[PDB]
Ligand binder design. Structure first.
Ligand SMILES: CC(=O)N[C@@H](CO)[C@@H](O[C@H](C)C(=O)O)[C@H](O)[C@H](O)COP(=O)(O)O
Lengths: 293, 297
């Protein structure tokens, strides 16, 4: 009786339509997703602010889910250290069934309310951490038990689901409800619900990191340059922020240990490396504040 | 700073110059406004996506596999979409495969240099015995990731159909590939953060490539995925439910017909709706390529 499980009347003839019609239909349904997220903007906004607050108190952003949801959690978290320069501990994706569940099934993983207890305890989940439970259905027991444990510790709990008034929503402090409508292939939550979940998670990390100063203007100043594109982007970023040349950007970057934010601080302040480090620290890595003062 | 200024993926977004000073709600609203651009960008790609699906369907029918390659988020999304196919469609793990630069180490974190390593893609493709009957989909926002470029070249040299998905127009990847899909989502909210709009566009396109191709293989009755073989207890319950949902019959007929059809839900549905016996239903279904409603005339 859940929306996620309903049949979609616009896809009833999909088994006899042309290739173009099927993809047109899917693309049409896809336009529903950003609209569905729009209803959720106030809750998402509140989520970010609370996450930022938790980050400032030493807590982490923890994602849990099974199957596609858990994989999306891992995907979003994976990108935080190279984009924002933070540790792997800061945003962690946990998936039902562990490491292999990223590619492979794990029978009963989504129904194992005992395992989520172990999974959260082995990372010492605490009152200061934030738990986001992700399940299109809103009733995945693994996620439910996870949320319950987090709530019992006094931790902030966020639920992301695609059915209204879910059990997950009831438990969680903040209920994000992405009502994307019945899927094109009945029950295929990986489609619109997966897309919505990616959009929401992308917001939770991007927005919170922007607010923690993990960027400057719209430049990725905390990027970890682990390849040719990224190494060239760091140089580019320093030039964009300072109007200096390529030679000076590379030189400073080298001196700043490939830290573009530090390099920018050094160039726009004429300060030495150690003093630029000192001023940045004193303003929590917020380059704008470190230069404003 | 090399030629990155030329690529939309590396360009600055006018709407987010001050994003480090905008309020929390302004930030999420902007990300949301920009998200709206993505299905629109994919709309203009529908004819190429169609061509790609049709090619993939031929390959599936010729015993070929659908192979995804990429680095970083792209690679991960290839792996994501492929990982979902066996449970979603009741297919073998071999039929859709996701390969990511740097292997299993890259799945949770970056691997230093992996996207640059043009030798490694040769090993990765050879290790799964990539052949001319397979379809290679190269996935890269920038359209110039050398790992993926070399991937495609190797595939092309074999005579395998090649598909590229990129977010910059007229890319090197597009030049090499037979079918070029070009999702122009515009500059990201955080400059160069291709995990965002490009990642979303990538997921949407991959989802179409697998979902539409599976539908064309006849896996569906109306908008139900019915190709399930009840090899154990939990697939049986899923089969019974889908037989019931498709034919509006009761649990009794669904369970009995499942038995007579050797645990094949699709054939069970065929028997019930046609009133034909197992062997007869099998013949008629084959004559219409395993497409249920075409067979039921
Ligand atoms: C830009 C960034 O800081 N991180 C992301 C994307 O946001 C990149 O990945 C990182 C480096 C990784 O290896 O985890 C990106 O996914 C690859 O460079 C693929 O680029 P592309 O081939 O054009 O799709």
């Amino acid at each position: 009786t859940l929306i996620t499980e309903q049949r979609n009347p616009n896809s009833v003839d999909i088994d006899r339509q042309s290739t173009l019609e099927i993809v047109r239909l899917m693309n049409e349904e896809d336009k529903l997703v950003p609209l569905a997220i729009e209803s959720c903007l106030p809750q998402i906004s509140l989520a970010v602010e609370q996450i930022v607050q938790a980050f400032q108190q030493g807590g982490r952003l923890i994602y849990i889910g099974a199957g596609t949801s858990g994989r999306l959690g891992v995907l979003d978290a994976s990108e935080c250290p190279p984009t924002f320069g933070v540790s792997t501990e800061m945003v962690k994706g946990i998936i039902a069934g562990g490491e292999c569940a990223i590619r492979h099934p794990v029978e009963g993983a989504e129904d194992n309310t005992k395992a989520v207890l172990n999974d959260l305890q082995s990372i010492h989940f605490s009152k200061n951490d934030v738990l986001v439970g992700i399940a299109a259905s809103g009733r995945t027991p693994y996620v439910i038990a996870g949320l319950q444990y987090a709530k019992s510790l006094g931790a902030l709990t966020i639920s992301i689901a695609s059915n209204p008034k879910s059990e997950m929503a009831e438990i969680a402090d903040i209920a994000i409800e992405t009502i994307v409508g019945p899927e094109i292939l009945t029950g295929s939550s990986r489609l619109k619900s997966g897309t919505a979940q990616k959009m929401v998670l992308n917001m939770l990390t991007t927005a919170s990191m922007i607010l923690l100063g993990k960027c400057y203007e719209n430049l990725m100043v905390d990027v970890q340059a682990s390849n040719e594109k990224l190494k060239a982007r760091a140089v580019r970023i320093v030039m964009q922020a300072t109007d200096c040349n390529k030679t000076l950007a590379e030189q400073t970057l080298l001196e700043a240990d490939q830290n573009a934010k530090l390099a920018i601080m050094m160039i726009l302040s004429t300060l030495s490396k150690s003093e630029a480090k000192v001023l940045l620290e004193r303003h929590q890595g917020k380059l704008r504040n470190a230069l404003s003062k």
